[PDB]
Design an enzyme around this catalytic site. Structure first.
Site, PDB file in Angstrom:
ATOM      1  N   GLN A 147       0.798  -1.226   0.000  1.00  9.37           N
ATOM      2  CA  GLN A 147       0.000   0.000   0.000  1.00  9.37           C
ATOM      3  C   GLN A 147       0.829   1.273   0.000  1.00  9.37           C
ATOM      4  O   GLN A 147       1.850   1.366   0.681  1.00  9.37           O
ATOM      5  CB  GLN A 147      -0.935   0.063   1.208  1.00  9.37           C
ATOM      6  CG  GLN A 147      -2.048  -0.952   1.053  1.00  9.37           C
ATOM      7  CD  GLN A 147      -3.089  -0.789   2.164  1.00  9.37           C
ATOM      8  OE1 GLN A 147      -3.334  -1.729   2.891  1.00  9.37           O
ATOM      9  NE2 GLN A 147      -3.641   0.413   2.325  1.00  9.37           N
ATOM     10  N   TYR A 332      14.409 -21.546  44.533  1.00 10.40           N
ATOM     11  CA  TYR A 332      13.820 -22.835  44.183  1.00 10.40           C
ATOM     12  C   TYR A 332      14.407 -23.335  42.887  1.00 10.40           C
ATOM     13  O   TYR A 332      14.574 -24.551  42.697  1.00 10.40           O
ATOM     14  CB  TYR A 332      12.296 -22.737  44.021  1.00 10.40           C
ATOM     15  CG  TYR A 332      11.497 -22.773  45.284  1.00 10.40           C
ATOM     16  CD1 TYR A 332      11.704 -23.778  46.263  1.00 10.40           C
ATOM     17  CD2 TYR A 332      10.523 -21.803  45.510  1.00 10.40           C
ATOM     18  CE1 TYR A 332      10.919 -23.788  47.406  1.00 10.40           C
ATOM     19  CE2 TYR A 332       9.731 -21.801  46.630  1.00 10.40           C
ATOM     20  CZ  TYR A 332       9.930 -22.787  47.582  1.00 10.40           C
ATOM     21  OH  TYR A 332       9.168 -22.769  48.737  1.00 10.40           O
ATOM     22  N   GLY A 444       2.998 -27.504  50.372  1.00  9.98           N
ATOM     23  CA  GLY A 444       2.207 -28.157  49.344  1.00  9.98           C
ATOM     24  C   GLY A 444       3.028 -28.771  48.262  1.00  9.98           C
ATOM     25  N   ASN A 480       2.897 -26.223  41.495  1.00 13.47           N
ATOM     26  CA  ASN A 480       3.975 -26.214  42.485  1.00 13.47           C
ATOM     27  C   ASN A 480       5.391 -26.149  41.918  1.00 13.47           C
ATOM     28  O   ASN A 480       5.713 -26.830  40.937  1.00 13.47           O
ATOM     29  CB  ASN A 480       3.820 -27.445  43.373  1.00 13.47           C
ATOM     30  CG  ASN A 480       2.437 -27.478  44.009  1.00 13.47           C
ATOM     31  OD1 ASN A 480       1.677 -28.428  43.822  1.00 13.47           O
ATOM     32  ND2 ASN A 480       2.064 -26.374  44.683  1.00 13.47           N
TER      33      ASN A 480
HETATM   34  C1  F43 Z   1      -3.358  -6.541   0.863  1.00 16.13           C
HETATM   35  C2  F43 Z   1      -4.599  -5.830   1.401  1.00 16.13           C
HETATM   36  C3  F43 Z   1      -5.652  -6.923   1.603  1.00 16.13           C
HETATM   37  C4  F43 Z   1      -5.493  -7.181   3.107  1.00 16.13           C
HETATM   38  O1  F43 Z   1      -5.881  -8.181   3.662  1.00 16.13           O
HETATM   39  N1  F43 Z   1      -4.934  -6.133   3.718  1.00 16.13           N
HETATM   40  C5  F43 Z   1      -4.388  -5.184   2.754  1.00 16.13           C
HETATM   41  C6  F43 Z   1      -2.909  -4.908   3.125  1.00 16.13           C
HETATM   42  C7  F43 Z   1      -2.884  -4.772   4.637  1.00 16.13           C
HETATM   43  C8  F43 Z   1      -1.462  -4.344   5.096  1.00 16.13           C
HETATM   44  C9  F43 Z   1      -0.738  -3.405   4.087  1.00 16.13           C
HETATM   45  C10 F43 Z   1       0.796  -3.399   4.342  1.00 16.13           C
HETATM   46  C11 F43 Z   1       1.732  -3.379   3.155  1.00 16.13           C
HETATM   47  O2  F43 Z   1       1.511  -2.574   2.206  1.00 16.13           O
HETATM   48  O3  F43 Z   1       2.679  -4.184   3.185  1.00 16.13           O
HETATM   49  C12 F43 Z   1      -1.652  -3.751   6.510  1.00 16.13           C
HETATM   50  C13 F43 Z   1      -0.667  -2.675   6.996  1.00 16.13           C
HETATM   51  C14 F43 Z   1      -1.714  -4.828   7.600  1.00 16.13           C
HETATM   52  C15 F43 Z   1      -0.388  -5.533   7.825  1.00 16.13           C
HETATM   53  N2  F43 Z   1      -0.110  -6.631   7.287  1.00 16.13           N
HETATM   54  O4  F43 Z   1       0.439  -5.039   8.537  1.00 16.13           O
HETATM   55  C16 F43 Z   1      -3.004  -3.116   6.248  1.00 16.13           C
HETATM   56  N3  F43 Z   1      -3.556  -3.506   5.146  1.00 16.13           N
HETATM   57 NI1  F43 Z   1      -5.081  -2.435   4.182  1.00 16.13          NI
HETATM   58  N4  F43 Z   1      -4.759  -0.784   5.366  1.00 16.13           N
HETATM   59  C17 F43 Z   1      -5.397   0.378   5.333  1.00 16.13           C
HETATM   60  C18 F43 Z   1      -6.536   0.736   4.572  1.00 16.13           C
HETATM   61  C19 F43 Z   1      -6.864   0.025   3.485  1.00 16.13           C
HETATM   62  C20 F43 Z   1      -7.663   0.587   2.350  1.00 16.13           C
HETATM   63  C21 F43 Z   1      -6.810   1.615   1.553  1.00 16.13           C
HETATM   64  C22 F43 Z   1      -7.713   2.440   0.613  1.00 16.13           C
HETATM   65  C23 F43 Z   1      -6.927   3.470  -0.220  1.00 16.13           C
HETATM   66  O5  F43 Z   1      -7.580   4.175  -1.016  1.00 16.13           O
HETATM   67  O6  F43 Z   1      -5.674   3.631  -0.120  1.00 16.13           O
HETATM   68  C24 F43 Z   1      -7.969  -0.621   1.466  1.00 16.13           C
HETATM   69  C25 F43 Z   1      -9.424  -1.114   1.747  1.00 16.13           C
HETATM   70  C26 F43 Z   1     -10.456  -0.155   1.155  1.00 16.13           C
HETATM   71  O7  F43 Z   1     -10.438   0.043  -0.077  1.00 16.13           O
HETATM   72  O8  F43 Z   1     -11.317   0.404   1.878  1.00 16.13           O
HETATM   73  C27 F43 Z   1      -6.990  -1.618   2.018  1.00 16.13           C
HETATM   74  C28 F43 Z   1      -6.761  -2.778   1.352  1.00 16.13           C
HETATM   75  C29 F43 Z   1      -5.739  -3.790   1.638  1.00 16.13           C
HETATM   76  N5  F43 Z   1      -5.175  -3.960   2.758  1.00 16.13           N
HETATM   77  C30 F43 Z   1      -5.192  -4.714   0.553  1.00 16.13           C
HETATM   78  C31 F43 Z   1      -4.155  -4.018  -0.370  1.00 16.13           C
HETATM   79  C32 F43 Z   1      -4.738  -2.793  -1.142  1.00 16.13           C
HETATM   80  C33 F43 Z   1      -3.813  -2.349  -2.239  1.00 16.13           C
HETATM   81  O9  F43 Z   1      -3.493  -3.261  -3.062  1.00 16.13           O
HETATM   82  O10 F43 Z   1      -3.439  -1.108  -2.257  1.00 16.13           O
HETATM   83  N6  F43 Z   1      -6.411  -1.242   3.157  1.00 16.13           N
HETATM   84  C34 F43 Z   1      -7.201   2.041   4.877  1.00 16.13           C
HETATM   85  O11 F43 Z   1      -8.327   2.437   4.405  1.00 16.13           O
HETATM   86  C35 F43 Z   1      -6.472   3.029   5.805  1.00 16.13           C
HETATM   87  C36 F43 Z   1      -5.607   2.342   6.884  1.00 16.13           C
HETATM   88  C37 F43 Z   1      -4.631   1.356   6.204  1.00 16.13           C
HETATM   89  C38 F43 Z   1      -3.893   0.421   7.167  1.00 16.13           C
HETATM   90  C39 F43 Z   1      -2.573   0.960   7.687  1.00 16.13           C
HETATM   91  C40 F43 Z   1      -2.746   1.971   8.821  1.00 16.13           C
HETATM   92  O12 F43 Z   1      -3.781   1.905   9.534  1.00 16.13           O
HETATM   93  O13 F43 Z   1      -1.828   2.795   9.052  1.00 16.13           O
HETATM   94  C41 F43 Z   1      -3.622  -0.823   6.320  1.00 16.13           C
HETATM   95  C42 F43 Z   1      -3.639  -2.074   7.163  1.00 16.13           C
HETATM   96  C1  LIG Z   2      -4.519 -22.253  42.879  1.00 20.40           C
HETATM   97  C2  LIG Z   2      -4.896 -21.168  41.864  1.00 20.40           C
HETATM   98  O1  LIG Z   2      -5.238 -19.980  42.603  1.00 20.40           O
HETATM   99  P1  LIG Z   2      -6.832 -19.688  42.946  1.00 20.40           P
HETATM  100  O2  LIG Z   2      -7.260 -20.662  44.019  1.00 20.40           O
HETATM  101  O3  LIG Z   2      -7.638 -19.837  41.679  1.00 20.40           O
HETATM  102  O4  LIG Z   2      -6.802 -18.306  43.504  1.00 20.40           O
HETATM  103  C3  LIG Z   2      -3.795 -20.836  40.856  1.00 20.40           C
HETATM  104  N1  LIG Z   2      -2.585 -20.524  41.618  1.00 20.40           N
HETATM  105  C4  LIG Z   2      -1.497 -21.276  41.581  1.00 20.40           C
HETATM  106  O5  LIG Z   2      -1.530 -22.429  41.156  1.00 20.40           O
HETATM  107  C5  LIG Z   2      -0.242 -20.594  42.141  1.00 20.40           C
HETATM  108  C6  LIG Z   2       1.001 -21.372  41.763  1.00 20.40           C
HETATM  109  C7  LIG Z   2       2.299 -20.568  41.943  1.00 20.40           C
HETATM  110  C8  LIG Z   2       2.462 -20.190  43.427  1.00 20.40           C
HETATM  111  C9  LIG Z   2       2.671 -21.406  44.342  1.00 20.40           C
HETATM  112  C10 LIG Z   2       3.897 -22.215  43.840  1.00 20.40           C
HETATM  113  S1  LIG Z   2       4.367 -23.594  44.923  1.00 20.40           S
HETATM  114  C11 LIG Z   2      -4.240 -19.639  40.028  1.00 20.40           C
HETATM  115  O6  LIG Z   2      -3.881 -18.482  40.341  1.00 20.40           O
HETATM  116  O7  LIG Z   2      -4.940 -19.838  39.017  1.00 20.40           O
HETATM  117  O1  LIG Z   3       5.075 -22.056  53.770  1.00 24.40           O
HETATM  118  S1  LIG Z   3       4.564 -22.593  52.430  1.00 24.40           S
HETATM  119  O2  LIG Z   3       4.970 -23.977  52.308  1.00 24.40           O
HETATM  120  O3  LIG Z   3       3.085 -22.397  52.760  1.00 24.40           O
HETATM  121  C1  LIG Z   3       5.035 -21.699  50.939  1.00 24.40           C
HETATM  122  C2  LIG Z   3       6.521 -21.836  50.766  1.00 24.40           C
HETATM  123  S2  LIG Z   3       7.221 -20.851  49.489  1.00 24.40           S
END
Ligand code: F43
Ligand SMILES: C[C@@H](OP(=O)(O)O)[C@H](NC(=O)CCCCCCS)C(=O)O
Ligand SMILES: O=S(=O)(O)CCS
Ligand SMILES: C[C@@H](OP(=O)(O)O)[C@H](NC(=O)CCCCCCS)C(=O)O
Lengths: 548, 442, 263, 442
Positions: A147, A332, A444, A480
């Site tokens: 683009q 640990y 634990g 753990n």
């Molecule tokens: C390859 C695609 C198909 C796809 O899936 N995404 C593309 C490309 C993708 C690429 C373009 C990057 C590059 O050039 O390498 C990125 C940046 C996403 C990425 N991969 O990082 C992007 N578009 Ni597109 N794309 C945009 C847009 C648009 C507008 C551009 C219209 C114009 O008149 O220039 C048109 C869609 C439309 O017609 O409405 C568009 C199409 C297209 N968009 C056509 C390529 C069009 C071309 O051949 O020139 N984008 C926009 O309308 C503005 C924002 C702009 C985005 C980048 C930014 O946000 O800074 C980018 C967002």
């Molecule tokens: C048990 C569970 O916590 P809750 O009971 O859901 O609050 C879980 N924690 C853990 O497993 C903590 C593990 C690391 C700290 C103890 C290591 S021995 C978690 O946050 O999802």
């Molecule tokens: O004291 S406890 O075994 O509860 C946690 C140790 S890091």
């Protein structure tokens, strides 16, 4: 020589490691600690920013440091650090380890390529894959490709964002641009390479690492979506498609659902989280993420490296913050990767197994599990009994129970090649430990260990599950500390003993065999140590968009 | 009866089945065929014995591209399928006289297990069927081959997948038409969870039986959600009878008279029929001569409108024999209908709005996919209260092979497992026979 | 009739555990503490204050006949509606004469109306406060207590796993007790949460090391190793094996399965 | 029958109800009382008319401490409760002759609505009862007072809460014993979702009827999850019969003979009884004289052990009349039993393991709460397959007022709404009468 003695001798300098007595109350409290002093000093400097709101104050509550506050050796390193430097909030390496996992997704390319050829009449060649990989490395970090009047992401803050490809088809691999290839034959020893390729077959995959800043600002559920959006843009651009036609929806469904591999699965409502969050990472998935398996043929070392990373992931970050929070669960977790203590116990068990059974020398039987788990548990307990300084180091029962049982469970897996026989051995170790010392872990701690023998080989509903596929949401395990990290080691252990290239998924294993990750997954110990030393440079900081 | 409406029920071939039937005779609350159909959907489980065996042989456990080296178990499960099925029967039934049904399919590679209604009656939800069937399959296999304790958990994992680490049976080798309630978008959406490609496979690609089965499930779901309660009940019944069941042959005749026509000509035929039947009337004639209409009977107008909608789908997608046009057809049928008349379109805008998002998510990078993967529990196509998804079922019957995610790709064994069930495969004729059974009891 | 066994094992450590658990085994009294001093160290109330309730007398709570409820005799604190309070101990791993699960098992055999929690670093009983005070006196006066290796402490309990101090006492970061060098006695200067006592409470002399090796319930290689108690290990393994077999189900329930299969 | 077991059924008063009953006569799959109890749990909905009215009067909409100023609606709903209930009945029923039941409670401030089984039969899950009841209440109120179109959505929000922005009825003024399935921890857990304090209020604090209701729901859930299939069925039936229903008066007699005793003395009585009845036997005598036992009948040993566990709870919590000790009791009853005998404890360790976490999450900072808020769908207490939660129900009956989250606080209206249902309030005697009804049909 016992492997932990070197650390004890440094940690307890001036004292005999075998002596039962010492002096306390003579260290000046918190003032004995460089880190505590630093913390107090920053707390005072924060007064102006906080405008009067009280803050960290060592005179609130417990007067820390009536005993000597320990340094810890990161096992397998020469780094000695205070415990605070291993807290996940204080350690950028631990945070980057998690971010690198959360921000990775794997997407098969064969379905998209079939959509191009079969539905769009467009031919796919090595050259067109190479051109696509170049495009997605501009699009994935936030560059526009179709683009007019697009704003874009600052490349300076997303230099860690990239995509690579790998394939089990050697003929195709020889033709892909090596700048963007994860080359299985170069990253893996020959036998492991051959094993990986037999399971992967003639299939091709892209590995997308979305920016670290994105998963920090948002969450893990963002990652498969972000990957899929930019895969779609990159097919449109590279293959010159109409930018918005029916076939495009097929790339989307493939990239978000039919051909995607995520790192973690969703949680039930009580602990709701989207994909690619730590509770959803199965233990065998994590063992495959860690890369020690492909640089070491020491099964004890491989298992120990997995346990170190998993202690950071599951106990410190997942249970210690996501599921709880606060001061959290640093020690640990550190009990399983510091001072070479777990190393001593596991190398004992591996050597006992080598001598009596052979590595992979037994079929799994209860006789063998009982023999090995009992022996390694007794050895482990005796170490805490012979070294008072060792027992003052692993001062919390949970720490001791986890480490003894980890050595017992991994060693049982080394002998038998069966992860569930391993975890049955872990449960035997726990109840024997309890009966020896008339204590076990925290209040634990043994919920899952008392249910564990019965559920280890169960085949029922929410009980039976092969151990490699259990994870933090397996019901008994969902709450753990002091288990999940070690279970990851038990998942790795039978596979390291066998010399397998992976534990559960060859796509995961290859997807992290990549020098361009930020965290070094070949040795989680060394990386965590570098973080503890404040030498690790993470990704995703915002210096370029904020005042100097 | 409660309502005064009576209809003639016509088959998919456009011939009269039952004359002068009270509307409630096709209510999901009364019709015995609908009750049995819903009971069968809830209690039926597909067991993939060939998949369990191959998963075990390769340790290909717990989903897409997982393998656990060293944990392979090699068992002749398919060769002993009859013995294993007999064991499953003994474990699943509640008595020898109950309605447990076990059927081997495809040379024993799959089993259709229909769990007895006694087990459903004392369970809170329909997951019991899968859970009980899975437990029986695991034990039957372990007992058949005396699988040792250290291998047994792999059998469990081959059957039920990664559960309970996953919230569902990820990577399992059994499946049900209804997914578990933990994955529902909306409360009461269980019956809406069947993808359009599965509907087409169950009805063996027969256009009006597919749209009927979809309408039956959708409208029955509207009773479950409380939408078809009180003031709104008659709207949903009339919708089922007309759009799903070809009441008074209106659906069929609209297609027949527009077989060489367009979406516009279908609109003209429907508006004309609605004027003849006095369903709508002129409210005001404007300066230009434009006549703005109002409904004389709002629920019946909505039913006439919905019937034209399905007919327009069949005409326009049938002309292309390409299903992608279905979302566009649903959209512009409603759009043109509203500006032709001044009346509210199908489902008072919600079918049109559903089609807008459906169009976008079947032609864009952001999500969705081809038309065959959508269903009433999908965030894109949930919004219309039963009046849109039957069009998607009809459309995918008419696709001649333009989709990557075709019936064969997404639903390849669904026909061989479920389509021998008569009420599933041929719902129109069997719902009419049910209506005949109770018509004099209303 | 039935003779309770209490715990398996062939060593002195096992028999010590059995003695603790056996309600007909009379615990030896090693010291005496006054009622006032016990109440002071508990720290929940002052002696002479009326017991404080948490709900009305029990006879006002029974609105309806419950035959099973009236089968059970309520303890006196329950009859009176007295609040629930606690005592908590840390036990040194250097052969403290009682140990955490040993305590829990002893309490559930000997005492009525128990809520007890076991942890590596402390062991707590919560009980109607009236009855707590009777139980606590026994727990402090008998061979279940050694003032050097059994610390009374409700918070900041660190010390079970630490080296002993230079006087042979367990670490206490709050120093709720101190060693009196003039007498050799251990004296409490704070109550169990750490508030200072107006009047210190003498808990007497520490047991000597040899007495602790004789009466302790922990296994230690330097005293009696777990490895030496082959009988105890055999029973532990049996419990483990039985739990594994029961969870697996298919062999221990084989005849149940055969009836379900119509065989 | 299938199993050879026969038991005598005794009441909560320790007197014989039915002699020589086949075990299966109390199966959730056979007993007509259990079927009716489960049907009533699924179909029953509590409508808080007083809460709807006050919510509307203050615009106190969508959850705690929400208010939407300017959107207040002042209606005399409770004053017209009879008329409104009559409208709800007309909307919820499927025929004049069906099993729809509407009962006004508490001077019309609440309504008990039991939705007809016909609606449950054609719905996929049990949420239909809440959804239909909500729809009926909304329309009944709007029709009774002719609420205008711009205020009507506030009535909807008062009844059903923040749905659908929330996945459930957050802040609603209707409730069900079962929560929506999207909040289930495990598949098939629907029947396990009832907090212990609710069970205590439904049985009016009668100890053994509370433990029975809990055991019935827990063990019926084990049939739903597939755990009580095949090899495991007999274990779950014997558990229900002995622990839940006082088979052979074993539970009652253990408590009675230990009314002045301890957890330990209950263990001694149970082990002696198990030896007498030849349920266990000496496997090996050790050097010290210690006798290591083995089960002669594993499912029956487990049932005896589970019965002793409940007796020990009643003795030890009953001695304290303080429910907090329940988790510790469950823990150490199992721990002591195992080291007294060498046998596996209740549920092969899982009751003990449940109790460890339950102790922790009822005495720590990390989660949980008091014993009354737990249930089988709670992450903490889900692990034992039906053998632990009956202890919690018994314990909270015996609490004399030590809890902040008491029955009164969590379950204050539950008794007045549900306890008049005889099967809910007095499950033991009514299950026995169901067993007598079918005993010779097995
Ligand atoms: C390859 C695609 C198909 C796809 O899936 N995404 C593309 C490309 C993708 C690429 C373009 C990057 C590059 O050039 O390498 C990125 C940046 C996403 C990425 N991969 O990082 C992007 N578009 Ni597109 N794309 C945009 C847009 C648009 C507008 C551009 C219209 C114009 O008149 O220039 C048109 C869609 C439309 O017609 O409405 C568009 C199409 C297209 N968009 C056509 C390529 C069009 C071309 O051949 O020139 N984008 C926009 O309308 C503005 C924002 C702009 C985005 C980048 C930014 O946000 O800074 C980018 C967002
Ligand atoms: C048990 C569970 O916590 P809750 O009971 O859901 O609050 C879980 N924690 C853990 O497993 C903590 C593990 C690391 C700290 C103890 C290591 S021995 C978690 O946050 O999802
Ligand atoms: O004291 S406890 O075994 O509860 C946690 C140790 S890091
Ligand atoms: C439809 C659905 O995608 P799926 O069909 O499930 O892949 C859903 N996405 C979206 O709703 C994308 C919304 C944001 C981008 C389009 C904004 S106009 C989702 O990812 O859960």
């Amino acid at each position: 020589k016992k492997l932990f003695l070197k650390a004890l001798k440094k940690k307890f300098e001036g004292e005999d490691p075998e002596e039962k007595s010492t002096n306390f109350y003579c260290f000046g409290g918190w003032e004995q600690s460089e880190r505590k002093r630093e913390f107090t000093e920053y707390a005072k400097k924060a007064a102006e920013k906080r405008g009067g709101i009280p803050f960290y104050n060592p005179d609130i509550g417990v007067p820390l440091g009536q005993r000597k506050l320990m340094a810890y050796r990161v096992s397998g390193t020469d780094a000695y650090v205070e415990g605070d430097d291993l807290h996940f909030v204080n350690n950028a390496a631990i945070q980057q380890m998690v971010d690198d996992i959360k921000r990775t997704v794997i997407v098969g390319m064969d379905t998209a390529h079939a959509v191009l050829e079969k539905r769009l009449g467009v031919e796919v060649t090595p050259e067109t894959i190479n051109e696509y990989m170049e495009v997605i490395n501009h699009a994935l970090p936030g560059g526009a490709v179709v683009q007019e009047h697009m704003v874009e992401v600052h490349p300076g803050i997303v230099e860690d964002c990239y995509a690579k490809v790998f394939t089990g088809d050697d003929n195709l691999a020889d033709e892909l641009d090596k700048r963007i290839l994860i080359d299985i034959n170069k990253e893996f020893p020959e036998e492991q390479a051959e094993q990986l390729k037999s399971y992967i077959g003639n299939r091709t995959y892209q590995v997308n690492r979305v920016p670290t800043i994105v998963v920090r600002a948002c969450d893990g559920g963002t990652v498969s979506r972000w990957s899929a959006m930019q895969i779609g843009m990159s097919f449109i651009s590279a293959y010159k498609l109409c930018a918005g036609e029916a076939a495009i929806a097929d790339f989307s469904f493939a990239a978000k659902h039919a051909d995607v591999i995520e790192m973690g699965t969703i949680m039930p409502a009580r602990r709701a989280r989207g994909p690619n969050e730590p509770g959803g990472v199965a233990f065998g998935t994590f063992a495959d993420i860690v890369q020690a398996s492909r640089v070491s043929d020491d099964p004890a070392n491989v298992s120990l490296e997995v346990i170190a990373g998993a202690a950071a992931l599951y106990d410190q970050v997942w249970l210690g913050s996501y599921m709880s929070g606060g001061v959290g669960f640093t020690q640990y977790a550190t009990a399983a990767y510091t001072d070479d203590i777990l190393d001593d116990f596991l190398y004992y068990g591996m050597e006992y197994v080598e001598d009596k059974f052979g590595i992979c020398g037994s079929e799994p039987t209860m006789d063998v599990v009982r023999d090995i788990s009992t022996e390694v548990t007794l050895y482990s307990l005796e170490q805490y009994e012979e070294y008072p300084t060792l027992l003052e180091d692993h001062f919390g029962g949970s720490q001791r129970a986890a480490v003894a049982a980890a050595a017992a469970g991994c060693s049982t897996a080394f002998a038998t090649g069966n992860s569930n026989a391993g975890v049955n051995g872990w449960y035997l170790s726990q109840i024997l430990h309890k009966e020896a010392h008339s204590r076990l872990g925290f209040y634990g701690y043994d919920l899952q260990d008392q249910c564990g023998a019965s559920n280890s080989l169960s085949i029922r509903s929410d009980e039976g599950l092969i151990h490699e596929l259990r994870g933090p949401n397996y019901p008994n395990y969902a709450m753990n500390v002091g288990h999940q990290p070690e279970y990851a080691g038990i998942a790795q252990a039978p596979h390291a003993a066998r010399g397998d290239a992976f534990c559960t998924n060859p796509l995961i294993k290859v997807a992290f065999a990549d020098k361009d990750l930020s965290f070094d997954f070949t040795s989680p110990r060394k990386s965590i140590a570098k973080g503890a030393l404040r030498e690790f440079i993470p990704e995703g900081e915002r210096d370029l968009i904020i005042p100097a | 009866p409660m309502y005064e409406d009576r209809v003639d029920l016509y088959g998919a071939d456009g011939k009269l089945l039952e004359e002068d039937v009270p509307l409630e005779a096709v209510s999901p609350l009364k019709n015995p065929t609908i009750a049995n159909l819903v009971s069968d959907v809830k209690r039926s489980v597909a067991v993939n014995l060939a998949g369990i065996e191959g998963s075990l042989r390769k340790a290909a456990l717990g989903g897409k591209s997982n393998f656990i080296p060293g944990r392979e178990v090699d068992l002749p499960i398919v060769e002993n399928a009859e013995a294993i099925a007999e064991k499953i029967k003994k474990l699943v039934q509640t008595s020898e006289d109950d309605d447990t049904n076990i059927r081997l399919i495809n040379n024993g590679q799959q089993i259709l297990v229909q769990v007895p209604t006694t087990r459903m009656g004392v369970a809170a939800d329909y997951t019991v069927s899968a859970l009980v069937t899975g437990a029986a399959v695991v034990q039957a296999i372990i007992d058949e081959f005396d699988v040792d304790m250290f291998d047994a958990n792999a059998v469990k994992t081959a059957v039920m997948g990664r559960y309970p680490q996953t919230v569902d049976f990820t990577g399992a080798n059994l499946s049900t038409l209804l997914g578990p309630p933990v994955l529902l978008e909306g409360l009461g959406y269980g019956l809406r969870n069947i993808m359009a490609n599965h509907v087409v496979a169950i009805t063996r690609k027969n256009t009006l039986n597919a749209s009927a089965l979809s309408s039956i499930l959708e409208q029955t779901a509207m009773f479950e959600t409380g939408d078809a309660v009180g003031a709104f009940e008659r709207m949903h019944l009339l919708g089922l009878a007309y759009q799903g069941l070809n009441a008074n042959n209106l659906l069929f005749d609209l297609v027949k008279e527009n077989g060489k026509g367009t979406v516009g000509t279908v609109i003209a035929s429907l508006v004309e029929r609605a004027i003849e039947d006095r369903v709508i009337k002129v409210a005001k004639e404007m300066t230009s001569g434009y006549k703005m209409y109002e409904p004389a009977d709002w629920a019946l107008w909505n039913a006439y409108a919905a019937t034209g909608l399905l007919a327009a789908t069949i005409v326009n997608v049938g002309a292309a024999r390409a299903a992608q046009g279905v979302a566009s057809t649903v959209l512009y049928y409603n759009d043109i209908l509203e500006y032709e008349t001044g009346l509210p379109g199908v489902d008072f805008g919600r079918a049109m709005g559903t089609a807008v998002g459906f169009s976008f998510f079947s032609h864009s990078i952001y999500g969705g996919g081809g038309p065959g993967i959508f269903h009433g529990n999908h965030v894109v196509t949930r919004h219309s209260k039963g009046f849109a998804l039957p069009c998607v079922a009809a459309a995918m019957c008419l696709d001649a092979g333009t989709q990557m995610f075709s019936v064969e790709k997404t639903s390849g064994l669904i026909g061989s497992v479920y389509s021998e069930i008569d009420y599933f495969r041929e719902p129109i004729v069997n719902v009419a026979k049910g209506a005949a059974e109770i018509k004099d009891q209303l | 009739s039935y003779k309770a066994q209490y715990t398996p094992g062939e060593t002195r450590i096992a028999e010590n555990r059995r003695k603790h658990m056996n309600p007909d085994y009379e615990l030896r009294k090693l010291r005496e503490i006054s009622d006032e001093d016990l109440v002071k160290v508990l720290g929940h109330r002052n002696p002479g204050e009326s017991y404080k309730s948490v709900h009305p007398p029990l006879d006002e709570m029974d609105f309806e006949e419950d035959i099973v409820r009236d089968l059970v005799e309520p303890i006196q604190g329950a009859k009176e509606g007295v609040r629930v309070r606690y005592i908590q101990f840390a036990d040194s791993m250097y052969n403290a004469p009682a140990q955490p699960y040993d305590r829990a098992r002893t309490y559930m055999w000997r005492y009525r109306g128990v809520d007890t929690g076991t942890l590596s670093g402390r062991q707590v009983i919560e009980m109607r406060e009236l009855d707590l005070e009777g139980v606590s006196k026994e727990l402090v006066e008998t061979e279940l207590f050694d003032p050097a290796t059994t610390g009374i402490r409700g918070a900041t309990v660190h010390g079970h796993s630490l080296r002993l101090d230079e006087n042979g006492l367990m670490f206490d970061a709050l120093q709720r007790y101190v060693f009196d060098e003039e007498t050799g006695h251990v004296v409490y200067v704070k109550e169990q949460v750490g508030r200072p006592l107006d009047e210190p409470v003498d808990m007497g002399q520490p047991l000597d090391e040899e007495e602790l090796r004789k009466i302790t319930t922990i296994y230690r290689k330097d005293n009696i190793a777990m490895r030496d108690d082959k009988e105890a290990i055999e029973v532990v393994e049996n419990i483990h094996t039985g739990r594994t077999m029961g969870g697996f189900g298919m062999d221990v329930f084989k005849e149940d399965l055969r009836k379900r299969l119509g065989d």
